[PDB]
Swiss-Prot record, chain E:
Function: Flagellin is the subunit protein which polymerizes to form the filaments of bacterial flagella.
Signal sequence annotation: none
Family named by the database record: Belongs to the bacterial flagellin family.
Annotated domain remarks: Interacts with FliS via its C-terminal domain (residues 537-576), interacts with FliW via its N-terminal domain (residues 1-44). May form a 3-way complex of flagellin, FliS and FliW simultaneously, in which FliS and FliW do not directly interact.
Organism expressing this protein natively: Campylobacter jejuni subsp. jejuni serotype O:6 (strain 81116 / NCTC 11828)
Induction profile: Translation is inhibited by translational regulator CsrA (at protein level).
Compartment(s) where it occurs, according to its Swiss-Prot or TrEMBL record: Secreted; Bacterial flagellum
Subunit structure: Heteromer of FlaA and FlaB. Interacts with FliW. Interacts with FliS.
Disruption phenotype: In a double flaA-flaB deletion, cells grow faster and are non-motile, flagellar filaments are non-existent.
Protein name (record): Flagellin A
Length: 48, 48, 96, 46, 48, 46
């Protein structure tokens, strides 16, 4: 029963680290997308 | 409902477990291949 | 005469810029495609290491091998598939 | 600098989508309490 | 001509991504359904 | 002062495009979270 646990279950020690890392990366990626969508507003200064 | 019948059923259940493990492993391999394909296509589409 | 020579040179260079941009597109496509083959090879090596232990029977080593088969099939698929407009990049016929 | 085919948007979207996939997988593991849930991440382990 | 070939290829890859996601859905359904059969066979063996 | 071949426009366009290239690259790095995305900026690094 212990040898099976070694294969099947997850260790919350590492799992919470992975989750927090992925969450901060999600925030960063959302900011990057929000900036990428806006990165073209400068063209209007040419046209106006 | 009989002793030797019970032991035979034990063996048949072990065999069935093995069979289902094999089939599920086939499914898993196909799934991983599809995942890799999807990643590569997602990149190549942006580049194209 | 000089003005026509310079105009010809300016037009030729303006087209050369587009030639260079197209070459950049092709090379970027090839590289960003090859990245996935790198990751797949990493996974293959990891699976071989996982099967190199002797707590696994032949029936599980067989699942490892069946997985490696599909992954290598995918690698071949990427190599034989990545192409610009028919020009197969990652196959070997993109020489010179 | 040409508009109507924003490439940075597509690139960022692809990256963030891959990261959301990873986050979802990690959260499902955190919920169920098992390292192998779908049996598609480890066949012989399963 | 080149732009039209590239546009056709981009649309085709964009549809192939949806094809791959549908295949992923089908395979995940199948696997998560096999899980219960595995548990049932375990129970059968234990009862035997 | 001769018109129909504005040169300051061409020069400014060249500079601005060269800058937008680096802006795009930096934004892609900010999105992906990696310093070497395309492996075209550090061969031995990759």
């Amino acid at each position: 029963k212990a040898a099976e646990s070694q294969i099947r279950d997850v260790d919350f020690a590492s799992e919470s680290a992975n989750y927090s890392k992925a969450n901060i990366l999600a925030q960063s990626g959302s900011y990057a997308m929000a900036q990428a969508n806006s990165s073209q507003q400068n063209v209007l200064r040419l046209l106006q | 409902t009989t002793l030797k019948g019970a032991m035979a059923v034990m063996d048949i259940a072990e065999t069935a477990i093995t069979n289902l493990d094999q089939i599920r492993a086939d499914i898993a391999s196909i799934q991983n291949q599809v995942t890799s394909t999807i990643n590569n296509i997602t990149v190549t589409q942006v580049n194209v | 005469a000089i003005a026509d020579s310079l105009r010809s040179q300016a037009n030729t260079l303006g087209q050369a810029i587009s030639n260079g941009n197209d070459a950049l597109g092709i090379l970027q496509t090839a590289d960003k495609a090859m990245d996935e083959q790198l990751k797949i090879l990493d996974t293959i090596k990891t699976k071989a290491t996982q099967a190199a232990q002797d707590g696994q029977s032949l029936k599980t080593r067989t699942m490892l091998q069946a997985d490696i088969n599909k992954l290598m099939e995918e690698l071949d698929n990427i190599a034989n598939t990545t192409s610009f407009n028919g020009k197969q990049l990652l196959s070997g016929n993109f020489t010179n | 600098f040409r508009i109507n085919t924003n490439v940075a948007a597509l690139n960022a979207k692809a990256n963030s989508d891959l990261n959301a996939k990873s986050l979802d997988a990690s959260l499902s593991r955190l919920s169920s309490g098992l390292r192998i849930n779908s049996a598609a991440d480890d066949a012989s382990g399963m």
